[PDB]
Design a protein around this nucleic acid. Structure first.
Ligand code: K
Ligand code: MG
Ligand code: MG
Ligand code: MG
Ligand code: MG
Ligand code: MG
Ligand code: MG
Ligand code: MG
Ligand code: MG
Ligand code: MG
Ligand code: MG
Ligand code: MG
Ligand code: MG
Ligand code: MG
Ligand code: MG
Lengths: 49, 140, 121, 325, 101, 567, 198, 132
RNA sequence: UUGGCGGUACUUUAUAUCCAUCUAGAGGAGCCUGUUCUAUAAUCGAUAAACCCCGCUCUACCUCACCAUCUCUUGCUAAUUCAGCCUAUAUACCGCCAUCUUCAGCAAACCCUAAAAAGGUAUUAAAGUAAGCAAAAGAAUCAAACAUAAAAACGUUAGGUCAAGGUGUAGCCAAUGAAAUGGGAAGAAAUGGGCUACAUUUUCUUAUAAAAGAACAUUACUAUACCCUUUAUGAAACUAAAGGACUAAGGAGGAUUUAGU
């Protein structure tokens, strides 16, 4: 059950009882990307109207 | 403990029933493992335990089995280059004889509870009983 | 999926691309993301006795708890300050004196020689 | 720019503590296995360690060991000087104090023999110790030129008149040459209920295995798997292969053979029987004959067996076609 | 989250074939014989066709449980050759060694 | 077959040197962080149950499944109320019971009693739990009791017990009067609460109070209700207040316990001991001998948990042995603890360490040193990690046996139990070692011990700038260095008397001078004079004259020595 | 300022050489270098190096040790376990003697593996083996019994083998094999009119 | 060239452990197996399920003890019991380890429905087999 | 003054090795299959040695990534202006490999020189020394050897793989994402590999590779094509197997080339 593992481990990361090196890595690439102005657009407001 | 020792250790209650006991003519214990040395130590532990309980035991080594399969070494193309893997199974058979049902349960419990990690057992009990009362007398 | 996730050591090795065909024959900088993380600290702000808070406080055996939304936002901002401060420390450097010119090695002190065989400093 | 740690040098104080810990280890291992500490030996230790820490690793250097420190550690890594720093041996600064201390003794012996002044083959079937063995005696690394020079000096000692002291000395550097007896191991001669003499031997050719039972007295009746040999072996070449052992020793029609061959094909089963008959027939022939059989190929097992197929090629040696370029 | 959308579709195919197993067994039995009238057999041939296509058990594909690779999988472990080799080459599979002979 | 490992910590603690509890605080803290981690897991399991629902275990394991405590029956029916009562929710069940009454739907008397049981037992308060109480005159329990149309014996009985549990003694007795007027019959449990009530209430006259409690017993026979063990245990626990007058009554109870057929438990003796061996006993001249008779009666018997004060017995029995200073009795008590599985009733964390502390302290005082050291290796650390006073008792025993050669070893043991920086212990170790002279080998060994105890003071001083070297340790450490081939170190320690401004003692000063004469170093002899001048000790002048005769003083030394003599 | 905890000395130092070792390792546990008073070394050694020491040795931890099972423990254990065992009847001193009084052989198999589930499909199968000589069979019955059973009968050994695995449980398959024997025996004695046409 | 599980040569300054030093072909020769179960023995079932549990149990232990693992863990299954043997650095306070053991044991016992025990051997620092 | 460079020869050393020698093949026919081309509304990658039954130990639906049509817009997860992407770059990489290659080298710490651009050997010895990685040894093929596997460093080919998975940078977010249905066609074409046949050392039958009785050139040998029946799996035969007839070509293959001690 891939949903149980991903959901359970995600919840544990938010409770401070598990550390996901991969997620922390991705969280910082998003933070840096948003500062550079390359972040995800909002839904319905994409480049094409 | 040098001076501090239990006085009257409590022992489990073993109550003799009125039901007759099973009679195993033979009891074959086939242990399997990837490691021969573990089988040697387990064989030593099991043969010593049998001799200490009065059980008659004999041991032989069934021929080992090796299962091999081939895989593709590269992630993409390069068909001719392969990697091969194998799993080795080794066997030690403990053939016990003339066991009552009480002796076979206590012995099997003791040796099964001490079965090392990576070892699988295959007990093959052979019970002997009288003929069915109906079969004893032909009835038309 | 939880099973496609790799460790930090493997993630930085790929991203940095130090060992590669281009690198050897002809900038990304590594960072440690566990530097400021204290075991038992999560975004939800739960408080775990014996892990991230005192197990006993004023003689009272603590129980599980969670920080309020205001308190957690402070803790989040404080860590952000420490990270920025740590980054500022990384930027800060002690400049050494130049020699006969600013881009030349002549005249530059490189310290004393190393100790000798029997602790001869 | 060095992080690799220095090769460890062992002080005499260090090895001394390693021998006290080992001696306390033996008393504990003896107490565990319920044996007497006084008589507990190196053999008992190795057996106990194998039971208590079963390892099935194929390489035995990688298995658990509780050996005496003298074994696991190199014999002589001890300090070669004292507290004051003065070396212990007058040849220390040569760098090979043990090699040159030995070459000093043998050169002084040679001089006394030459100044002071029969067959020299006091020892036969012996060889000079190999460099690896010499290095073990000295406990120091030697070069090929150092070994070659050492032997020449020892040879010169033998050439000269040698008292019993010299002969004992050169003996230390002579190792008995291994004695591999290329002589067949004759089987016993059992007796049947009828009282007739018979010998048995096994044989293996390819995957076939045979167990022959030659009888000392017979009319030449060979029965394979309870069948006759003309019926069992309808091919002439298989029967000729059974004829080779007896025909060679001119013993046709003088023995009664009972064979049991399982496995392999027709030719592999005849070959397996031939060896089984040749090995059983040894008990009823003279030693000079047994040597004639051994030298005619009748007593050697054939080691040729099918080679495995290799991945990425059509066969054991056959390769896939090299696509036309 | 499953590995990809292809593994998700297969997972649904596996859960709908389990639901309709008894039904497809009982109905298909009426067709795999010569003892019942051909009129009934032709009609049972249509009841089975009307069931949803994802109930059909021949639309299940064995994919690596960790990478969702459709081919190259070993059925005893449910892993692809690439994933199996990574666990095996690191001593993480109990009893699997390289084959030297 | 197996016995306790004397060189290992209790099995709960992790078998690793880094993770073994050094002190008693780390023992409890390690068993409070483990329980906290278990509670953190049970919180997650019970809060995200969808992730812990796949069951792959055959046979099925019920105790490894997520728990559900919130009612899942939505409809408002007597059945739904029964669920809440089963789940033990107090406020929710009251709401649905009132709602059932509002509709008027029938509610079974048995179901109405299960509601009162929950409310009476928890006293109208939600059950205690952990996640992220007197009886109230106006409460749901009493209100629901009145609303009940039909009452039965159980209903009244439940109220009497809940009231007594939540300290409503006066009301509970009134409720019982109603039960008698209705002609209903109470059960054993209700009679036990009533006896517990009369005792807790303070009656002016004991004779009246005792005759009252007996009247409850007399009504227990009129109603054909037979007493249980708890009934007698409750009466004896009440009697512990009147030590003087409860002795004859207490014995009569135990005789009646056997005649009825109730078997006295460990708790029953725990109460007689309290009543016969008062802790605050002024009359220690002629103590009672009952403890000897009790232990003879219980010799070899095995006991099981049958009351809530069984654990208390062993800790109380060992204490009584220390008061009487009878070590033979302590062996009987410990011998009883070892029969069967009596070890399980020693007590909890507070009473487990008191029993063994009292036992081991008694051993060292009244036992041969050889036997005392056998007990020491067995009990410590496996049974209990002792507090520092235990080591002071052990060191004193070694001194009384003239076996001070072992004092260095006891010091090494103490460091593992977090006594490395204990001032009282360090002062005792050095004191005994340096109290008298010893052969050269023993003095050298003591000197090494003195050096180790010095490092503790030195390392401690490094941490704390406001550090004080106590005067007596300085004297003991300096003397030991002189006596044990460490004279050079002792001369350096002479300067520490001035750094910390500690007054050197007359004995120590003259000892330094004696060593100087053997060495023949006038310089070292004058160094002692310098320190004597600093503190203006009168003997310093005499010591300076002694140096003049002991050694030949050079003219330069004469001027230097004369200056110090003037100073 | 921060204080790093200091590990205690290993408890092997306090262990006497005449200790009660069974108490040290009562049950199966992993190798603990701090509890095993042995200078054991394991690991392929580097050139001019000795095998690695026990402390921090993953190879020793990977071994299924038998420290809990020592000749002293095994003998002390079996002494307690003797009360459980029952005595085999002395009269049945031979295999032939057993066949006389107990002709029926019932084979049952157990399987022990590692995992969360104790279930194995192969444990249901049962096998009954009886010799026709042991059964009271007339000349007619024995011929009828041998024809009905087909290949279950072995002429060389004269043993009838009934293998029953169709039922889910072992108690059902066992009761079925006994049932199959009863019907075959009783049917063999019955004589049908069509049998006269053989 | 083969790149599988080979810690390649640096310049003599890389500290590799015993397990890392040995390439795959030394398995069953110089180094053993990190997991020992009966699921790959001949005529045994549930290899796929035992292997999946191992993959998870290794990722769980790394995250639960982040930076505190000196070497790979060893998993030992006997009957339905699971035993995790991990070499852990002495970085965290002692009481914190008692928390993570109680937590990681209870959590994995309610997740796989087996009795799970954690065995921790504390090292002062990573043990270096050789410098490569 | 070092290095490079040769289309350099001679002399050794070995190589199923250039040639020579040996055996069975390929190149011709029929088929199976990969590729290119042509071509389709209709994937992608590999594509000198080191691609071409290659990723696939495998495509009727599914697989699937492609094409057409219709449909969904917080759209797997506890949370997230987020989910998702087989979208571009293998010339950003990890991972896992090919190639030289079972070739013999790569890298670091010291010491020495009337200065070092570099070098550092002499054995009856003249400045080199002492540790690593590879080779070797050891282990595996359950005696022993041999053999076979395995092993084979640093580099070379920006070699292969963003489509195993992960991932840097850039791009899509009512669409480059998700889902359903139906399709993804063929060849007077070239080419790689395999299969079968061309027969008499053969064909058919019984046995069994023993022996025996028949057949033996126009269809005798000879179709794993097409076509026609039946059975197997499936929901679906478009697939596979077994018979049936039908039978065409093929008569041992030009230069040239592959493997084997
Ligand atoms: K690459
Ligand atoms: Mg400038
Ligand atoms: Mg071939
Ligand atoms: Mg399929
Ligand atoms: Mg398709
Ligand atoms: Mg489709
Ligand atoms: Mg797409
Ligand atoms: Mg590339
Ligand atoms: Mg490309
Ligand atoms: Mg070998
Ligand atoms: Mg090699
Ligand atoms: Mg490229
Ligand atoms: Mg799309
Ligand atoms: Mg033939
Ligand atoms: Mg069909």
């Amino acid at each position: 059950n891939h949903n149980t593992y991903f959901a359970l481990m995600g919840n544990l990361r938010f409770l401070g009882l598990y550390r996901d090196e991969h997620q922390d890595f991705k969280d910082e690439q998003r933070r840096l990307k948003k500062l550079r102005g390359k972040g995800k657009p909002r839904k319905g407001e994409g480049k094409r109207a | 403990l040098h001076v501090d020792v239990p006085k009257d250790v409590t022992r489990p209650t073993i109550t003799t029933s009125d039901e007759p006991d099973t009679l195993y003519k033979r009891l074959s214990i086939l242990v399997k493992a990837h490691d021969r040395a573990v089988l040697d130590s387990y064989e030593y532990f099991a043969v010593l335990a049998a001799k200490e309980l009065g059980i008659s035991i004999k041991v032989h080594e069934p021929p080992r089995k090796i299962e091999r399969f081939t895989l593709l070494k590269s992630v993409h193309i390069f068909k001719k280059h392969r990697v091969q893997y194998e799993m080795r199974t080794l066997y030690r058979c403990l053939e016990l004889k003339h066991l009552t049902g009480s002796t076979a349960s206590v012995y099997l419990e003791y040796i099964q509870r001490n079965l090392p990690e990576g070892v699988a057992m295959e007990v093959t009990k052979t019970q002997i009983q009288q003929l069915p009362e109906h079969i004893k007398e032909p009835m038309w | 999926s939880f099973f496609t996730k790799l460790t930090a050591e493997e993630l930085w090795k790929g991203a940095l691309a130090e060992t590669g065909a281009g690198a050897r024959k002809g900038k990304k900088k590594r960072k440690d993301l566990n530097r400021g993380q204290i075991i038992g600290e999560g975004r939800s702000g739960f408080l775990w006795p014996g892990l991230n808070v005192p197990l006993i406080k004023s003689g009272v055996v603590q129980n599980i708890g969670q920080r309020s939304k205001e308190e957690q936002q402070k803790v989040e901002a404080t860590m952000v300050e420490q990270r920025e401060e740590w980054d500022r420390k990384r930027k800060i450097k002690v400049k050494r004196e130049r020699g006969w010119s600013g881009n030349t090695w002549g005249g530059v002190s490189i310290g004393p020689p190393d100790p000798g065989p029997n602790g001869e400093t | 720019n060095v992080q690799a740690s220095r090769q460890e040098s062992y002080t005499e104080d260090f090895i001394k503590k390693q021998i006290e810990e080992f001696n306390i280890g033996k008393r504990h291992l003896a107490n565990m296995m319920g044996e007497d500490p006084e008589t507990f030996a190196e053999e008992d230790i190795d057996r106990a360690i194998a039971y208590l820490f079963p390892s099935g690793l194929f390489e035995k250097r990688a298995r658990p060991m509780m050996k005496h420190p003298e074994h696991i550690f190199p014999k002589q890594r001890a300090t070669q000087w004292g507290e004051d720093g003065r070396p212990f041996h007058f040849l220390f600064y040569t760098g090979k104090q043990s090699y040159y201390s030995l070459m000093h003794d043998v050169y002084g012996k040679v001089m006394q023999l030459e100044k002071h002044r029969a067959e020299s083959r006091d020892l036969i079937g012996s060889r000079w110790l190999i460099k690896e063995e010499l290095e073990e005696m000295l406990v120091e690394k030697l070069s090929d030129e150092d070994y070659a020079q050492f032997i020449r000096l020892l040879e010169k000692l033998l050439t000269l008149p040698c008292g019993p002291a010299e002969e004992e000395f050169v003996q230390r550097f002579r190792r008995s040459v291994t004695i591999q007896s290329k002589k067949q191991l004759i089987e016993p001669v059992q007796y049947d209920e009828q009282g007739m003499a018979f010998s048995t031997s096994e044989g293996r050719r390819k995957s076939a295995t045979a167990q022959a039972v030659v009888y000392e007295h017979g009319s030449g009746k060979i029965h394979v798997n309870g069948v006759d040999y003309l019926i069992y072996f309808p091919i002439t070449q298989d029967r000729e292969q059974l004829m080779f052992p007896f025909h060679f020793l001119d013993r046709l029609e003088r023995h009664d053979v009972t064979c049991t061959v399982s496995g392999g094909g027709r030719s592999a089963q005849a070959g397996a029987i031939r060896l089984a008959m040749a090995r059983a027939l040894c008990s009823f022939v003279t030693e000079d004959e047994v040597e004639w059989m051994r030298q005619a190929g009748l007593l050697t097992p054939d080691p040729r067996i099918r080679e495995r197929k290799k991945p990425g090629q059509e066969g054991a040696r056959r390769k896939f076609t090299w696509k036309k370029r | 989250y499953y590995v990809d959308w292809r593994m998700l579709r297969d997972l649904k195919r596996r859960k709908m074939a389990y639901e309709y197993a008894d039904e497809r067994l009982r109905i298909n039995s009426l067709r795999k014989n010569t003892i019942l009238p051909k009129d009934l057999q032709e009609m049972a041939g249509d009841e089975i066709a009307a069931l949803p296509r994802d109930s059909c058990p021949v639309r299940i594909r064995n994919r690596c449980v960790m990478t969702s690779r459709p081919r190259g999988v070993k059925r005893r472990w449910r892993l692809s050759r690439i994933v199996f080799r990574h666990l095996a080459d690191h001593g993480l599979l109990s009893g699997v060694q390289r084959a030297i002979w | 077959t197996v016995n306790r490992d004397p060189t290992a910590a209790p099995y709960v603690f992790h078998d690793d040197p880094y993770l073994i509890p050094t002190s008693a605080l780390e023992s409890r803290s390690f068993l409070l962080a483990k329980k906290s981690g278990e509670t953190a897991a049970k919180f997650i399991i019970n809060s995200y149950p969808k992730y812990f629902q796949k069951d792959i275990a055959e046979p099925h394991i019920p105790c490894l499944m997520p728990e559900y405590f919130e009612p899942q029956i939505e409809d408002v029916s007597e059945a739904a109320l029964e669920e809440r009562i089963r789940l033990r929710k107090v406020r929710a069940s009251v709401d649905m019971f009132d709602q059932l009454l509002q509709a008027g739907t029938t509610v079974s008397l048995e179901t109405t009693n299960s509601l009162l049981d929950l409310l009476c037992y928890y006293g109208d308060q939600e059950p205690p739990a952990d996640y992220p109480g007197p009886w109230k005159a106006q409460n749901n329990a009493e209100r629901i009791f009145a609303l009940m149309p039909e009452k039965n014996a159980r209903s009244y009985c439940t109220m009497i017990r809940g009231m007594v549990k939540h300290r409503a003694y006066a009301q509970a007795l009134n409720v019982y009067t109603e039960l008698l007027n209705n002609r209903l019959s109470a059960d054993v449990y209700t009679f036990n609460a009533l006896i517990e009530a009369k005792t807790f209430i303070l009656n002016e006259k004991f004779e009246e109070k005792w005759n009252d409690i007996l009247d409850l017993l007399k009504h227990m026979v009129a109603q054909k209700v037979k007493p249980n063990l708890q009934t007698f245990n409750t009466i004896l626990k009440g009697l512990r207040k009147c030590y003087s007058l409860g002795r004859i009554p207490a014995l009569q109870i135990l005789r009646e316990m056997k005649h009825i057929g109730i078997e006295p438990s460990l708790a029953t003796y725990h109460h007689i001991i309290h009543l016969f061996y008062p802790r605050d006993l002024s009359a220690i001249k002629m103590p009672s001998l009952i403890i000897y008779d009790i232990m003879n009666e219980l010799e070899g018997r095995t006991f099981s948990p049958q009351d809530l004060d069984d654990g208390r017995f062993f800790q109380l029995a060992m204490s009584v042995c220390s008061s009487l200073r009878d070590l033979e009795l302590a062996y009987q008590v410990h011998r009883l603890l070892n029969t069967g599985d009596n070890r399980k009733l020693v007590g909890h964390d507070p009473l487990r360490k008191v029993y063994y502390s009292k036992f081991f302290s008694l051993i060292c005082s009244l036992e041969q040193i050889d036997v005392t050291l056998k007990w020491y290796k067995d009990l410590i650390p496996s049974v209990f990690l002792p507090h520092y006073q235990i080591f002071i008792g052990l060191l004193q025993a070694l001194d009384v046996a003239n076996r001070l050669e072992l004092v260095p070893q006891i010091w090494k043991d103490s460091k593992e139990y977090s006594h490395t920086f204990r001032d009282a212990l360090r002062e005792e170790v050095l004191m005994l070692m340096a109290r008298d002279k010893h052969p050269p080998e023993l003095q050298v060994a003591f000197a090494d011990c003195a050096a180790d105890i010095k490092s503790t003071y030195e390392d401690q001083s490094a941490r704390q700038p406001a550090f004080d070297w106590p005067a007596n340790p300085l004297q003991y450490i300096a003397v030991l260095f002189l006596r044990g081939g460490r004279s050079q170190e002792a001369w350096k320690m002479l300067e520490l008397f001035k750094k910390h401004k500690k007054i050197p003692r007359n004995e120590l000063l003259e000892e330094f001078m004696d060593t100087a004469k053997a060495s023949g170093s006038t310089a070292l002899a004058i160094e002692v004079v310098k320190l004597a001048s600093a503190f203006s000790l009168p003997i310093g002048e005499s010591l300076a004259q002694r140096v003049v005769m002991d050694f030949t003083v050079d003219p330069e030394q004469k001027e230097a020595l004369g200056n110090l003599t003037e100073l | 300022r921060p204080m790093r905890r200091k590990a205690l000395p290993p408890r092997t130092e306090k262990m006497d050489t005449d200790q009660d070792w069974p108490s040290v390792y009562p049950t199966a546990a992993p190798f603990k270098p701090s509890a095993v008073p042995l200078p054991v070394r394991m690991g392929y050694p580097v050139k001019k190096g000795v095998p690695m020491a026990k402390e921090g040795n993953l190879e020793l931890l990977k071994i299924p040790n038998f420290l809990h099972l020592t000749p002293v423990a095994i003998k002390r254990h079996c002494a307690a376990l003797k009360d459980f065992c029952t005595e085999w009847p002395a009269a049945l001193d031979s295999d032939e003697k057993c066949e006389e009084h107990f002709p029926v052989e019932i084979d049952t198999a157990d399987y022990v593996s590692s995992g969360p589930s104790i279930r194995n499909p192969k444990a249901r199968a049962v096998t009954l083996r009886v010799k026709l000589s042991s059964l009271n069979l007339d000349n007619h019955a024995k011929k009828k019994l041998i024809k009905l059973v087909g290949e279950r009968y072995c002429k060389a050994t004269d043993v009838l083998t009934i293998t029953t695995d169709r039922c889910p449980l072992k108690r059902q398959n066992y009761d079925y094999a006994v049932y199959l024997l009863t019907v075959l025996y009783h049917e063999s004695w019955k004589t049908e009119d069509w049998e006269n046409s053989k | 060239k083969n790149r599988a599980a080979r810690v390649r040569v640096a310049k003599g300054n890389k500290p590799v452990s015993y397990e890392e030093a040995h390439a795959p072909h030394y398995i069953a020769h110089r180094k053993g197996w990190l997991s020992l179960h009966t699921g790959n023995l001949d005529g045994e079932d549930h290899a796929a399920e035992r292997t999946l549990e191992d993959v998870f149990l290794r990722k769980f232990m790394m995250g639960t003890f982040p930076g505190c693992l000196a070497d790979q863990i060893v998993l030992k299954r006997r009957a339905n019991q699971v035993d995790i043997c991990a070499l852990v650095l002495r970085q965290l306070p002692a009481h914190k380890f008692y928390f993570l053991v109680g937590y990681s044991e209870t959590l994995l016992s309610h997740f796989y429905k087996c009795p799970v025990r954690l065995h921790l051997q504390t090292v002062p620092s990573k043990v270096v087999y050789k410098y490569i």
